Subunit: 334 residues, 4 copies
């Protein structure tokens, strides 16, 4: 029914109201960083290895103590009921059935306790709130509901200027709510409060500067996500993929280094791991599957990605994800 | 009404006679430098910083002793009554209300004494005239009218070959005059005469060679504008943005280093300051706002740019323009 | 009738059912490596030499002890009866008449004994089978039939995901069979078994990593083909042409270094030899000639390539292929 | 009537039979080098100098002892009566009136004695003939007719494959003859014979390798033309402009270094001299002027180029062509 992610997006374009598709597809400003995320992955070529034993090819990884089926998690994407009536529950169920971590947003259209109840060891994405006490109660909620990691999003002191939204007069419909509720910019002091408040690993999403990666490790982060936020925050922010190699070297095994932005295939996952990522986050494509076919859509996308990943690892001579990290790359043209 | 500068230009294209739009939009020769000004800014990506205190984000700067609201001034653009009946007065009033310096041209279609009377601490742009005595009387006029800086334009021994103008038979209409009047190429001797004749800071516009920047500082310039003149002078002249980093390093704090050409957004201002500029000049977009909506148009453009700038600084972790200058960049592709 | 290879392909597009043309033309995944093979050859420019003695310009080479008319062989392409009723026999006859080695596939639609009987010293391309004993009997067959080299294809643990085929529901027609029959991934242990089983030179096709080239030489390979398999295996695998220079230097005369992917002209052959290749393989264009005009088509293509090669060598000042290898190159843009 | 060279070519496209325009416009093979000649000049940007004394801006040069009005000569272009009934005489007259050297071809459609009689100190371009004695008699003819330099073309052991000509069945019409007559590849021995046979400076056209430039100087060449022959010889040969800087450094003042290919404006002339050329050759654009308007056309083109050159030198701060050679450049993108 679907052979690549490309045909998914077309499906979602038909199903969704254009102002919802635009909300999902769009970037900030002139969408330079949105485009650059794809340019970066397309410039990377792999140097595959030949003739290696591929008896037990496995795409599994251990991350934050738990096994995952792929080196991938579902990116935090707010208001998932915009794309399908079951919203976050459809996606979280498909993620659990696929063995892939799911990231519950601070701004989910279903409450985090409900999404966590689905099972499948989920993660919680935090946005720093007005006062510290509410922020730490959010952490506590997610911790009590059984979430396994606090994904502290650090690149949104405020939202980027999403011009597609401005020229649509797009507003949150009234059947979509911030189910976790009945906002202020974070600092390294905020990170310290969260780290002190939880035993869960704390993961900072939106690190792009080598020195912010070093400071994340010193701050006790269990990991970072190297990310320009899908090109929706600072327009002109460097793509995560372009900083990944440097950051991995500076961090020097001190924490997990994830990357997101533009992952559209198993080959892209391979590239990311060959540049040194522990895992990737996938955002928009998961929402395309959700809008096209609900939970079964996302399941199919996750299975198609699982096959593409295992395909690419074997054709490159990698029996484990660790070996994929030891691949070399070469930059190409366009 | 307007979300980016892009939609402004479209507005001005409708309102203006095509031969006036062409006069404003065009470059010299094959317009290679015109295009290259945009290519240069689009190749630059910022490495934003995270989690920094943004309590008092301020886009203000001190330049030539005075406070400015943004790190930006209105570029000198001759014959502004081509674009609107109020011409330079509409733009200067909007500049003053926005806290942004305005550059009165030697070739303004309203006299400099009138434009300065608007208030708002303006600057005077000088073209070297036939004989030294008239040139220095121009300086004296501008100094007496209360102008705060002499912007000595040094890259026009004569005008570039504007081919759009040749193929339109465009000529100055008879309702547009050089209101300052009832021309010869400048040299370093001319700069010295002007410097001796005024206590105002002297700023050389059109410096592109690292060694001309060094000599500007030795000559006593209070600053330079690194500029290929909007691609209207030497076609094939390197973009200012591409020389900015080198020049800033060679000048080593010896004078203010401004840049112009292609600034089209708050992100572009951020890029320029991350490459080391003290401030930028904006030319064509201001004229688009003037032609579309007179003084209120320019006010809106200046406010939209002010928001975009403050947006971009905060998303990049910069509480001051000084911090924006300490950002790193990375060159991308196309 | 035909002046370049370009007009051949058009001819084949008309003659062939679209799902057969797609099977021939297509790559894996998003076809990034397919495209990159052409991008790589188009970025390379030659620095020709002038005024050298061109009395006896000869395109001949000695490879694996035998003389060849051109520094080129026909790439292994399975199921050649898809393109013409005479299939591999038409191509092998044209190859023999042109003095160019022909590579019999494991998956040929005519048996290898028949294709070898055509004459013209052919080569045998091996895919590792289910059990070692069948694999080595294949080698033995080809050796007994008089094949001169075992081209061990090492980059297909399994096939790449050919999306053009998936979206056509393309399947092998019933008049096309694997005539050699009435599959498992290879390892360096497999290479060693083959080397021990034959006195023929063993050539590993699909080497892209410098260290796999070094290991090939240590393994006793008489040569390698530096190849990403025409962009049909790992999508995103670096083009052979981009690794050729490095590999040639690492191998340091230890074995023949061939390259394939994207060769479309005599100039391309020249580029490959200037980067250090001993010879190239040509795949798709030969099938275009086969589909357009059977054996006479391939003969014409081989003659047109022979002239283009000799043309390019002489205009570059090369009397022998050895001299072409001593040419320098320069990388260009797009 | 004409503002740039662009509008000339359009004029010639209308006037000329398409198979004649194609003969003039076309390159060899896939026309990669034809295109690359323009790409190379468009990637080069100048770093202009400011505020320099421009009292006596002069575009004149001394080359081979004689004064020329511009740093430019008309490239050798065979069979000029294809483009206009007056052929080489129209062009040579316009060249003389403009103070620009003219290169008489071995294959001119008017005899060299006639073209030289026009005046204006012309040059003779030599192709090595069947036997040495005829070749040296050609040199002697040109020397006796008063030619001032032997432009020995060294990059045509035979002609490139001009595919536009093959697909037009283009043949020399019967009103166009090789007026110098009633061919064999050259070697360094041929150069030595010519040098011994004439006191005229010998200039080798088609040098692209740094070491061929060194050997040209050792051979006693009074100069070289760094040229890939307008992309009509080896398709894929590096553009002259891309080798010019290296060659100028290796030659180290030992001979004049000219360049051709793609010169289309005064800016292009400036770029070439900033990379170190003594002068350029211009080919196709001169034929466009000849076909559009005969002798007056070429005169207009030469005057338009003279103005563009003087324009560009002054805007870059160069009072002499020597100063233009001391400009720096910067490579850009596309
Ligand atoms: C597409 C998309 C991405 C969003 C997202 C909403 C959408 C519709 N949201 C929003 O914050 C946002 N600013 O848009 C949000 C939207 C509306 C209101 C408030 C917030 C969140 C979020 O909550 N908390 C986060 O940590 N990241 C977010 N991302 C980025 C995502 O997680 C990956 O970084 C990136 O999508 C990888 O790229 P790719 O899609 O190419 O795989
Ligand atoms: C668009 C434009 C730019 C002009 C301008 C006129 C126009 C219509 N004029 C003219 O000299 C000129 N040569 O066109 C002029 C026009 C007509 C007659 C005589 C003179 C002046 C000028 O007086 N004195 C100067 O110092 N600079 C000038 N600029 C360049 C501007 O100040 C910025 O350097 C650049 O515009 C930044 O680029 P961007 O627009 O992308 O922000
Ligand atoms: C176009 C094409 C290339 C094939 C080919 C089939 C086709 C239709 N086959 C296939 O394996 C394949 N995977 O498609 C095969 C097809 C279908 C079923 C099973 C196998 C073989 C093969 O048997 N054994 C090999 O060693 N290489 C193969 N190549 C790659 C070729 O030899 C050159 O490497 C490359 O074509 C140079 O590039 P270019 O064409 O630009 O000159
Ligand atoms: C366009 C053109 C260029 C020719 C030319 C003929 C044409 C129609 N001819 C031909 O040899 C040729 N091979 O085409 C020729 C044609 C037909 C029969 C036999 C010979 C000669 C030639 O006699 N002796 C030479 O030394 N160079 C030649 N060029 C190259 C020229 O002098 C500059 O190198 C280049 O044109 C600079 O580039 P640009 O045009 O961009 O300024």
């Amino acid at each position: 029914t679907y052979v690549s992610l490309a045909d998914l997006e077309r499906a979602a374009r038909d199903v969704l109201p254009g102002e919802i598709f635009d909300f999902l597809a769009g970037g900030s400003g002139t969408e330079a960083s949105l485009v650059a995320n794809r340019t970066a992955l397309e410039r990377v070529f792999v140097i595959p290895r030949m003739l290696r034993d591929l008896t037990d090819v496995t795409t599994e990884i251990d991350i934050f103590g738990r096994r995952a089926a792929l080196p991938m998690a579902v990116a935090p994407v707010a208001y998932q009921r915009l794309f399908h009536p079951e919203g976050e529950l459809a996606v979280a169920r498909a993620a659990r059935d696929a063995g892939v971590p799911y990231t519950i947003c601070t701004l989910s259209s279903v409450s985090l306790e409900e999404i966590a109840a689905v099972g499948g060891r989920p993660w919680f994405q935090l946005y720093w709130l007005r006062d510290e006490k509410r922020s730490l109660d959010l952490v506590r909620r997610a911790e009590d509901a059984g979430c396994e990691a606090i994904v502290f999003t650090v690149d949104v002191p405020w939202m980027g200027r999403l011009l597609r939204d401005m020229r649509n007069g797009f507003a949150l419909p009234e059947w979509v709510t911030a189910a976790n509720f009945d906002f202020a910019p974070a600092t390294w002091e905020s990170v310290e409060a969260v780290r002190a408040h939880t035993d869960l690993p704390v993961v900072l999403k939106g690190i792009l500067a080598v020195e912010d990666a070093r400071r994340a490790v010193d701050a006790g982060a269990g990991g970072i996500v190297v990310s320009n936020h899908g090109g929706r925050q600072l327009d002109g922010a460097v793509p995560g993929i372009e900083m990944l190699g440097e950051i991995v070297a500076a961090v020097s095994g001190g924490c997990e280094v994830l990357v997101d932005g533009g992952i559209r295939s198993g080959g892209d996952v391979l590239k990311a791991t060959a540049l040194g990522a522990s895992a990737v986050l996938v955002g928009r494509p998961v929402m395309w599957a959700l809008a096209a076919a609900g939970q079964d859509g996302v399941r199919q996308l996750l299975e198609l990605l699982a096959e593409e990943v295992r395909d690419a690892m074997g054709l490159a001579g990698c029996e484990s994800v660790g070996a994929a990290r030891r691949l070399n790359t070469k930059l190409g043209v366009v």
